[PDB]
Amino acid sequence: SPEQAMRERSELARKGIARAKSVVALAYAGGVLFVAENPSRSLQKISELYDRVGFAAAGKFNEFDNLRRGGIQFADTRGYAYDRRDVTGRQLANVYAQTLGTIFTEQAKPYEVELCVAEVAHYGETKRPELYRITYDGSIADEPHFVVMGGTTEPIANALKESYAENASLTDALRIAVAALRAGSLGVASLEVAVLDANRPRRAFRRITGSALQALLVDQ
Amino acid sequence: SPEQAMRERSELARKGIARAKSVVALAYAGGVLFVAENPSRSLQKISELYDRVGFAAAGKFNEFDNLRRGGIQFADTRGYAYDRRDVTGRQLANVYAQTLGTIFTEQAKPYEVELCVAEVAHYGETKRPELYRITYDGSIADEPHFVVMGGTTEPIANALKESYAENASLTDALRIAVAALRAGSLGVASLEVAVLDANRPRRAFRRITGSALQALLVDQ
Amino acid sequence: SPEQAMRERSELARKGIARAKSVVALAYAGGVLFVAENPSRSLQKISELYDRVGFAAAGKFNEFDNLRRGGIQFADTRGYAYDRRDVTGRQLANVYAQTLGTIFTEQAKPYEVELCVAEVAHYGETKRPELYRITYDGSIADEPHFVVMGGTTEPIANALKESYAENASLTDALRIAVAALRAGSLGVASLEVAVLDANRPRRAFRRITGSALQALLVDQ
Amino acid sequence: SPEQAMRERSELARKGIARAKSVVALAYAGGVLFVAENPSRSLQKISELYDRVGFAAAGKFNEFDNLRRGGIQFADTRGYAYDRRDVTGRQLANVYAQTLGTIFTEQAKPYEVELCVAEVAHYGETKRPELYRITYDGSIADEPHFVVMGGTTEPIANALKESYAENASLTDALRIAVAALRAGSLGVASLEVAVLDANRPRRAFRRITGSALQALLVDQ
Amino acid sequence: SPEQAMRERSELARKGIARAKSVVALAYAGGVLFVAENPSRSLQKISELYDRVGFAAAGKFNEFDNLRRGGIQFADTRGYAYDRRDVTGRQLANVYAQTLGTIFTEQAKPYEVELCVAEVAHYGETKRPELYRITYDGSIADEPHFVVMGGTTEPIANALKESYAENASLTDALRIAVAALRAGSLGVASLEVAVLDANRPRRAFRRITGSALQALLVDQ
Amino acid sequence: TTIVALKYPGGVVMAGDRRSTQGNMISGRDVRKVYITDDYTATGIAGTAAVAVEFARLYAVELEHYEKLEGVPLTFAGKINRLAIMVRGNLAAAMQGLLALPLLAGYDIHASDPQSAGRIVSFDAAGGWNIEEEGYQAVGSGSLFAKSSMKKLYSQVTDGDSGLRVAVEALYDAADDDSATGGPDLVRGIFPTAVIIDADGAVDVPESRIAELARAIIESRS
Amino acid sequence: TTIVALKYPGGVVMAGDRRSTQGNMISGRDVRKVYITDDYTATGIAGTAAVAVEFARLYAVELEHYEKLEGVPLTFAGKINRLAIMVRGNLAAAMQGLLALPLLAGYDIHASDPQSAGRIVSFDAAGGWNIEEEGYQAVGSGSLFAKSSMKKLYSQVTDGDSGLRVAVEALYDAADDDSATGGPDLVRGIFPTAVIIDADGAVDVPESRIAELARAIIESRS
Amino acid sequence: TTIVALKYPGGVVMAGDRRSTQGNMISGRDVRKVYITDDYTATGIAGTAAVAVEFARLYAVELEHYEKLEGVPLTFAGKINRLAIMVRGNLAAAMQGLLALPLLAGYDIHASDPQSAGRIVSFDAAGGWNIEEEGYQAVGSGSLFAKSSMKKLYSQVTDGDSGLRVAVEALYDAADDDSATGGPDLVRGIFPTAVIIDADGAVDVPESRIAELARAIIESRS
Amino acid sequence: TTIVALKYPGGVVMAGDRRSTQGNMISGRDVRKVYITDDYTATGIAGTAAVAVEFARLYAVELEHYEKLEGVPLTFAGKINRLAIMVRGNLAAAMQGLLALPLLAGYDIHASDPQSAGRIVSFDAAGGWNIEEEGYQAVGSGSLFAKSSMKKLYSQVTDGDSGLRVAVEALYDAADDDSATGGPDLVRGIFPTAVIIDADGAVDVPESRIAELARAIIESRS
């Protein structure tokens, strides 16, 4: 039952996604903010890809960490082949979509993940930060404002449908995010946070450490 | 039934794990302690991987001994490629997770094992010893205190949830361990014991022999 | 039914083992004694592997003779690669365990055999002779005293659980063995016998011929 | 049903064997005698392999003729690799056993054959002529006196259990054979006969022609 | 059902054979006569292979024309490798038997054909012309007198069991053949006829044209 | 070509000219021979110009590639090894003509005494390497001259700006003897490039302080 | 080296010396240069000794291999072709140094007149072959001499023993002129080997009748 | 280059200079030519410097790799063999230029009499090896000189410190005749490196006792 | 190098010196050139030392490997063939420089008359071989001299100890003319190694009876 077969796959994956932790990214004044709950100190669900493009995913770790590498793999290569300025993250979105697409067909069990690639304009240039959501089955859509994935989204997503401050400040967007995240459930300085600082000269990625995090964090 | 198929796999493996012997590792003052019941004199379930990273697994021997080698294989290579100081065990955790992950999908029967990779800071440097648990299905989690695997854990694990002395002494932790192990069942100088001595200059691994073992061993 | 599938395999193999002849090896004063019932003059179920390590198996001949070669194959190579003194039989145990382990998964029908690798210390050196039992499914365990396989073991094994003279003489152990073997059933100078003579300078293997056999053989 | 599957295979083959013609070889004064009923003039069921080793099989022709070649293939090579004197037929028995063993597992339908490899000592040297029976499933056994295969054996085999003259003459053994063969059923100079003449200097094979055959043939 | 599976195959093939046209070859004074009903002018069911060996088949054209080529392929090569005189048709029988044998196992659907290879002694030399029947399943048998295949044979074959003139004349054998062929059913100069003229110096094949055919043809 | 690296108390400085010779005919007067590889590593490359810009560029990507992957930059030990491999995997070429010989300068943020954290590693055509531990090193057409002048002017090295002057003075001394090296072109306004590395990072020295420094040396000699 | 083959009424004879030269220094005095390939085929081989024993041995296996497989020995035509292939598949070697040049002698049990069933086939380094049809042929260091003496003594060939004497006399005549050929060594008791083939088969001629024959020739010339 | 190994009652000592010649122009004065491979094995390597640090480093990893895998260090016999393979698997290179020739010094913890457990194995460019059994050996540009001086001063070897002085004195004697060897540089404070192996293990001899030892020899000759 | 093998009534003896020359400069004085391959086979090897210890060692393993596999040792015929293959599969090397030439000595436990069961097989660079059937053979730098002396002293061979003296005397005679062969070193106590093979097996002749034998020859000549 090739048709019914595909439904089973979807299911299996969609389930795994739900039983995994929550991850959210959104557009703010200086770029894009990455925030996801993560008790671990070493196992990161958010990462740099290339100069101006960030990676964040939720699901089965070993599966998305693989893809994370593959991305960095693809990106670096592409930039050496042509030039740095010729990597887009819109590209990486295509790639991940292709890859996950293939997996969902060829591999025995499809990957239990949901991904997010985010780009924020080069140093001087000014452009609307772009977000992409790549699903387990290979489908791809781009949110202009914010992306939620992993666990139950409806409440966390709904909280944002309202709390989203179009041109938020870093501290303001973080506040909004952590609170919007608690909506699907706590929320301590024991989680993973990093941003794509459009303001940064070259490498627009910066992880928010433990001490400095507190300065911006939301009271509950 | 791709979904139901996967449940059968889990089962088969989870069972094998249970019918196999018990293995425990924990964090103590000088590093990490490896202890598992093993009547054999030659077949070892605990081993060195690289300078500051130890391997311990329980399950079907020929299956984890394979992975044990592959680790040492990967590690040594990685250290020659870049440098000794650039192997992490967090790396090896990823690798094992990847490998077991693939096995659980591609191989006919998934591996009947559960693994533990442990790192303890380099000679001079001081850092919190880290423990990783890699399951048969490729899932990976890191305990900050102690890891139990093989046989029935609940009683052995529970004994530790209390008996765990955060900053134990070698002899104290061994005592705690052996007693905590008896909790799921004896416990003679006829078993396998080794440690990751953070204090050691380079190679932070040392197996605890038969005679010297007695000096530290717990009365029942 | 991946789980139920594996049970069928076990069965099929376990059965073949039973319907085949009986093979026993044990530790005696001068090393290890190999004795198995075999009407044939040419088809041998017991063989040398390397300097200080013996092979004995029971089951479907063409299957274990294959493995027998593979062993000798592996051993010789290993000894040329590094040195003679670096082959262990504990090694060969791993290999056979690996091999049979793979077969039991990949091959259509799993091998109907049970194997025994035995090592006895080098010439000058004195060490406790070691025995390993490798099963059809790849499981591996080491007896410190004696190993039984093929046919119905319980009676033959039980006879030994008592008749085992820890430090037997050659003639005494042979006596014990042949009698212990009759326990699961005769026992004429028409069978296969060889030993690992720890006393021997280099090649610690020697087959017990027809004439000289009689001198030591047990009356019934 | 991997277990039940194998039973079906056995069946299919065991059947084909039965519905095919009868073939018998035995030990006599001067070596080994090969006799099988064969109306054909060109399609031979008995053949030379190497200097002192003969091949005879019954079953589906195209299948055992293949194996017959493979043998001659293997033998010649082996003899060029090392020396003539280093081919044993005991070797070829292992090979056939290996081959048929594999076939019975890998190939869709297992070979409908039963084989016999026979060696008779070198010119000067005097040794007990040896016979080997290789079955469809890869099992291998060696008769010290005589081998029967193809069609219904019980009556043909039984006739020999008595009529077997341990040290028969050529003419005597032929007499015994043809008569023993009629026991499962005629028996005219219209069949295939050849021997392994231990007496011969090098190539110990000789086919018994039509005219000279008569001189030794049994009246019914 | 590996056993039942093979029965289905046999069936499918055996059926195709029946629903196809009739082909017959027989031994006569000057060699072998090839006659088969064939309305077509270009699609030939009878062909030359090598100097002294003829090919005739019935069944699904595209399948046996393939084999026909392969034969010619094999033959020519063999003759260049060694010598013309070293091709036997007994050889080609083996080959076809091997090929069809493989097909019947490996290929999805087994070939719907039945074949006949025929040899007739070299120019000077005098020898009994030989006929071989190769079936769809790879079985091979040699008739000393005549071979029938394709459609319903029993009546055509039976007609010959009596009408067969051991040492017939060309015109006599043709008469016998065409009449024996009508027995399973007309029979006009609209069919395919050729012979292996033992009398011919080198290439012992000659097709019987339309005009000259009439001179020998049987009235009904 | 002449590249030179200097070790001073704070960290390391590296600077090389910009001449480009083809035969005994000038074919460039503005070549960037020294590049920043990453935050604490700068790399200069002599020999074939095609392999030069390729080493620097490719290496840099490999270093950053590891970091993005493993989340942490390589040990200084690793950084040395990677570069060393790269050089060996080019022996085939170098044998025929395409010879490119690197000189690595860096700051080990992990060094025991962060005032000796300045590192200079010279490289072997075959893929060898020795950590210099002698303060100065040079590779190229007139390195022989630089090293020999810089021998006398090393005592004068005191700090950043201090060392930098000795660097630029060696490059002037080199070009004064190696026709293939090329000193400071006033008429056209072209001056050797430089990079400094201290605990803070590696940064390009602006031609301003170099050009100024150049004239100092020219006048004092004049 | 000198191998020679002779055709007489019954069948063919072939005999070759046993000297082995390395430079101009003897390195063998007992080499078997002629071998029986199968029942009706004998083959002698000149040039590189390593390829010599290998050709003979390997060929022999291939012939018997065909027989065991197809149930019938090859045509004499086939036997010739197989050997010819073998020689071509060695041109690569022969170009460099490893030159091995066969001489085939045989009895066609299928020949029209079984008194001309004696065959001699000489071979080409490239893989060529001509059926000699002239009674005698020789290959080797001194074949040139043998062929030229044997030219005169061919009329004398009448039967088996008759022909064999002419063979042994050519080998003596050869060795008398080709320092690399080596005649009969009385002092040590070493005499050329020989094989005869007639309708009955091919058999080694025992040194007895050769040694005897040798002395005949030595005395008669003396 | 000159590396030298000595066998004394306790075990073995090995020491080699640190000069590095490129043409007849010094290009190094601090090269580590002797390395500890594992607990009881030290290895020195002469010839191409790129292959030198690579052999030592890679070998060491292979030895420890076996131990981690099989749970027990190799036989001294094995250790010898592995190194030997490595050397053969480099003939291709060495033929063209990249020649690297090792000298193995070790302590067989399994030796019969643990006072003869000192081992010295010299190696062949092709991959050969002889266990020296003669107390001293040397490889390199001036090994010829060392071996010949150390021939006279061997009687003087009594114990650890005793043997070590003879080693350092040969290295001095070598550099005094081989312009490519380089003796002790007082002016700059650079002295040959050394490693000793006894039942306890293999340890680097601190320059202190070497430098001291060096002056002894310089003064006594003075 | 000079290896020599002798055939006496009981079986065979083989002995070769231990000199090792590199240019015209001694580089060894203790090399084992003769090895026991299995119970009844001993093999000596001349030419490149790297390929020497490798042939002997590897061969030995292959022989024993067959035995463990097939349950019976190879025919002497087989033993000869395997070794022969090995030699051919090294022609590539030998062409360039790595030339290794074996000499096989053995006892055919299956020989007709077990007093002629002594075998000597010399080998061809290309992979050829002749069973010597002449009692003595030698390979190496000074084999030419040994063979020519041993020619005179062969009558004297009567039994084990008898033959062995002739062997050691040839090696002495060789070294007396071939500067690359090296006779018995009294001053240092180094004597040629030897192996004997009779119906009982093959065993190393202890230097004792050799050293003794050596002095015999030295004094008698003196």
Chains G and I form CB pairs within 8 A to the count of: 25
As beta bridge partners, residue C50 has C53
The residue to which tokens 């080296």 are assigned:
G1
Check CB contact under 8 Å for F78 and B91: no
Active-site residue among G1, G2, G37, G43? G1
Q: Which residues contact A92 (CB under 8 A, 6 or more apart)?
A: A49, A50, A53, A55, A71, A74, A75, A117
> What dihedral do alpha carbons H161, H165, H166, H171 form, nearest 10°?
140
Length of chain C: 220
Helix (H) or strand (E) holding A94: helix A90-106
Q: Are C64 and C76 in contact (CB under 8 A)?
A: no
Query: Within 13 A of A161's CA, how many CA atoms are on the CB side?
Result: 7
Q: F106, F76 in Cβ contact below 8 A?
A: yes
Q: How far apart are the first and last CA of chain C?
A: 50
Q: Which residues of E107-140 are buried (b: 16+ CB within 10 A; e: fewer)?
A: eeebbbbbbbbbbbbbeeeeeebbbbbbbbbbbb
CB E54 within 8 A of CB E47: yes
Neighbouring chains of H at 3+ CB pairs under 8 Å are B, C, F, I
Output DSSP code: residue A199: T
**Residues A92, F68: contact at Cβ < 8 Å?**
no
Nearest-CA neighbor of B60 among C98, C91, C15, C147?
Answer: C98
Sign of CA dihedral B187, B192, B197, B200: positive
Edge-first strand order for the sheet with B146-149 is B146-149, B23-28, B31-36, B192-197, B205-207
Cα gap H119→H110, rounded to integer Å: 12
Neighbors of chain B by Cβ distance (3+ pairs < 8 Å): A, C, F, H
Round to whole Å and give the CA distance between H95 and G199. Answer: 60
C139 CB neighbour count, 10 Å cutoff: 15
Residue pair D40/D20 in contact by the 8 Å Cβ criterion:
no
Distance CA B131, CA B24 (A): 11
Among A210, A194, A196, residue whose Cα is nearest residue A44 = A194
- Which region holds residue A138: left if phi is over 0, alpha if psi is between -120 and 50, else beta? left
Between CA B116 and CA F50 the distance in angstroms is: 49
Q: CA D152, CA D145: separation in Å to the nearest integer?
A: 19
Question: Solved by what technique?
Answer: X-ray
Amino acid at I193: T
* CB contact at 8 A, I207 and I184: no
Tell me the shortest Cα–Cα distance from I51 to chain H, in angstroms: 7
**Closest to G56 in 3D by CA, of G36, G39, G30:** G36
Give the span between the Cα atoms of B176 and B198, in whole angstroms.
20
CA dihedral B73, B77, B83, B85 (to 10 degrees): -10
- CA gap D67, D95 in Å, rounded: 10
CA distances to G103, G131, H97 from G78, rounded to whole Å, are 15, 13, 53
At E36 the three-state DSSP class reads: strand
Between the CA of residue F4 and those of B59, F154, F165, what are the distances in Å?
59, 13, 12
Q: Which of F116, F93, F87, F216 is nearest to F161 (CA)?
A: F216
Structure tokens at G219: 């005395």
| Other beta carbons within 10 Å of C217 | 18
Distance from CA of I49 to the nearest CA of H (A): 6
Could you give the count of Cα atoms lying within 13 Å of I115 in the half-sphere of its Cβ? 3
Q: Which two tokens stand for residue D138?
A: 């890869």
CA angle E86, E90, E94 (to 5 degrees): 110
H23 touches chain B (CB under 8 A): no
Chain I interface mutation, best of C80, C83, C87, highest count of I Cβ atoms under 10 Å: C80
Indicate left, alpha or beta for I185 from its phi (over 0: left) and psi (-120 to 50: alpha). beta
Termini Cα distance of chain G: 24
> Using CB atoms and an 8 Å cut-off, which of residues 30-89 of chain H contact chain B?
57-58, 61, 64-65, 68-69, 71
- Is F134's Cβ below 8 Å from some Cβ in H? yes
- Name the closest residue on chain B to residue A59, using Cα atoms: B139
Phi, psi of H121, deg, nearest 5: -120, 115
The CA-to-CA distance between both ends of chain F, in Å, stands at 24
Tell whether H28 is within 8 A of chain F (Cβ): yes
- What is B1-220's CATH superfamily? Aminohydrolase, N-terminal nucleophile (Ntn) domain (3.60.20.10)
Give the Cα separation of G59 and B201 in Å (integer).
Answer: 67
Per the listing, tokens 């690197």 go with F102
Contact yes or no for B140/A43 (Cβ under 8 A) = yes
Minimal CA separation from D159 to chain C, in Å: 23
Q: Are A39 and A136 in contact (CB under 8 A)?
A: no
The DSSP secondary-structure symbol of B216 reads: T
Do B and I have ≥3 inter-chain CB pairs under 8 A? no
Chain-centroid distance, C-alpha F198: 15
Do B101 and B113 touch, CB atoms closer than 8 A? no
Neighbours of F204 (CB within 10 A): 14
> Which stretch of DSSP H or E encloses residue E68?
helix E61-81
Chains C/I: 3 or more C-beta pairs closer than 8 A?
yes
The token duo for F153 is: 């002017």
What is the count of structural domains for chain G? 1
Pick from B94, B106, B142: which is nearest to A65 by CB?
B94
For residue F185, CA distances in Å to A204, B54, F17, F172, F173 come to: 38, 61, 10, 11, 14
DSSP I120: E
Count, residues in chain D:
220
How far is the C-alpha of H87 from the C-alpha of H65, rounded, in Å?
A: 18
User: Which residue shows structure tokens 């490997």?
Assistant: I65
HSE value, Cβ hemisphere, 13 Å, CA-based, for C188: 5
Q: Is A41 helix (H, G, I), strand (E, B) or coil?
A: coil
Phi and psi (nearest 5°) for F181?
Answer: -100, -50
Q: Do D84 and I77 make contact, defined as CB atoms within 8 angstroms?
A: yes
Strands I25-28 vs B205-207: parallel, antiparallel or unpaired: unpaired
Q: Do D41 and E101 touch (CB under 8 A)?
A: no
Question: Per DSSP, which regions of F59-209 are E strands?
Answer: 100-107, 118-123, 129-131, 136-139, 193-198, 201-205
Q: Are I45 and I51 in contact (CB under 8 A)?
A: yes
Element (H, E) at F92: helix F91-96
Is the backbone of residue F47 left (phi > 0), alpha (psi -120 to 50) or beta? left
Can you tell me the distance from the alpha carbon of H153 to that of G170, in angstroms, rounded to the nearest whole number?
71
How far apart are alpha carbons A35 and A25 in whole angstroms? 6
CA–CA dist F219, D111 (Å, integer): 99
Residues ≥6 apart with Cβ < 8 Å to E12:
E109, E110, E112
Asked if I82's CB is within 8 angstroms of D86's CB, the reply is no
Distances in Å between the alpha carbon of D139 and those of C19, D100, E3, E172? 13, 9, 21, 55
Separation CA H211–CA H183 (nearest Å): 11
Spatial distance between the Cα atoms of B130 and G105, rounded to a whole number of angstroms: 83
Cα atoms found within 13 Å of the Cα of residue H127, Cβ hemisphere only? 19
Chain A residue with CA closest to F65: the answer is: A76
Q: Rounded to 5 degrees, what are φ and ψ at A2? A: -35, -40
Element (H, E) at C37: none
Give E88's contacts in chain G (Cβ within 8 Å): 70
∠D83-D86-D90 over CA atoms, to 5°? 150
CA–CA gap between residue E35 and residue E168 (Å, rounded): 15
Catalytic machinery residues of H: 1
Distance separating alpha carbons of residues C155 and C143, to the nearest angstrom: 17
The pair of three-digit structure tokens given for residue A94, joined into one six-digit string: 């295509």
What subunits make at least 3 CB pairs under 8 angstroms with D? C, E, G, I
CATH of the domain at I205: 3.60.20.10
| d(CA C147, nearest CA chain B) in Å | 15
Rounded CA-CA distance D62/D66 in Å is 6
Position C22: which residue type?
S
Contacts of G among chains (3+ CB pairs under 8 A): D, E, I
Determine the Cα angle at D151 with ends D147 and D156, to 5°.
50
**Distance between CA atoms of residues G99 and D191, nearest Å:** 50
How far is C211 from chain B, CA to nearest CA, in Å? 38
Structure-token pair, residue B204: 């932070």
Distance CA C161, CA C183 (A): 12
Q: ∠ CA(B49), CA(B53), CA(B58), 5° rounding?
A: 70
Quick one: which of C135, C175, C144, C171 has its CA closest to C159? C175
Distance of CA I164 to the CA centre of its chain: 12
Dihedral over Cα of A9, A11, A17, A20: its sign: negative
**CA–CA separation, E118 vs A147, rounded Å?**
79
With tokens 């765990």, the residue in question is B164
- What is the Cα–Cα distance from A56 to A46, expressed in whole angstroms? 4
DSSP G114: T
- D91 contact residues in C (CB cutoff 8 A): none
| φ/ψ of residue H194, rounded to 5 | -145, 155
Angle at G7 between CA G1 and CA G8, to 5 degrees: 135
Distance of CA C140 to the CA centre of its chain: 13
CA nearest neighbour of G17 among G27, G26, G6, G4: G4
Contact of A72 with chain F, judged by CB distance below 8 Å, is answered with: yes
- Does the distance separating the beta carbons of E85 and G78 come in below 8 Å? yes
Distance CA E111, CA E59 (A): 9
Residue H73 gets the label, from left (phi > 0), alpha (psi -120 to 50) or beta, of beta
Angle at D31 between CA D27 and CA D35, to 5 degrees: 60
Q: Which domain holds residue H176?
A: 1-222
Instruction: Answer whether F130 sits within 8 Å of H31, measured CB to CB.
Output: yes
- Contact indicator for F166, F156 with CB cutoff of 8 Å: yes
In sequence order, the β-bridge partners of residue E147 are E25
Q: Do F81 and B86 touch (CB under 8 A)?
A: no
At H3, give phi and psi (nearest 5°): -115, 145
Size of interface H-I (CB pairs under 8 A): 29
Between CA B25 and CA B120 the distance in angstroms is 13
| Nearest residue on chain E to D65, alpha-carbon basis | E94
Active-site residue list of I: 1
Tell me the CA distances in angstroms from F126 to F87, F99, F123, H28, H73, one per residue in order. 7, 10, 8, 16, 32
State whether residue D202 sits within 8 Å of chain E by CB: no
Please give the Cα distance from D84 to D80 (Å, whole number). 7
Residue F90 DSSP class? T
User: What are the phi and psi torsion angles at E26 (to 5°)?
Assistant: -150, 160
- Of C125, C115, C114, whose CA–CA distance to C52 is shortest? C125
Q: Are I122 and I134 in contact (CB under 8 A)?
A: no
DSSP 3-state assignment of B201? coil
CA C91, CA C78: separation in Å to the nearest integer? Answer: 10
Contacts of D191 (CB under 8 A, 6+ apart): D35, D36, D37, D38, D39
- State the helix-helix crossing angle for B170-182 and B153-163, rounded to 10 degrees: 150
Q: Where are the alpha helices (DSSP H) in chain D?
A: 2-19, 61-81, 90-106, 153-163, 170-182, 210-214
Q: Quote the CA–CA distance of C122 and C196 in Å, as a whole number.
A: 11
Closest chain D residue to the Cα of G72, Cα to Cα: D42
Select the residue of E2, E98, E139 nearest D8 (Cβ to Cβ): E2
Contact I164, I205 (CB under 8 A): yes
Report which residue type is found at C100.
Answer: L
CA distances to D173, F130, H25, H50, H122 from H98, rounded to whole Å, are: 75, 17, 19, 8, 19
F106 near F58, Cβ under 8 Å? no
Judged on CB neighbours under 10 Å (0-12, 13-18, 19+), C220 is exposed
Crossing angle of helices C153-163 and C170-182, rounded to 10°: 140
Round to whole Å and give the CA distance between A47 and A25: 12
Distance CA I163, CA I154 (A): 8
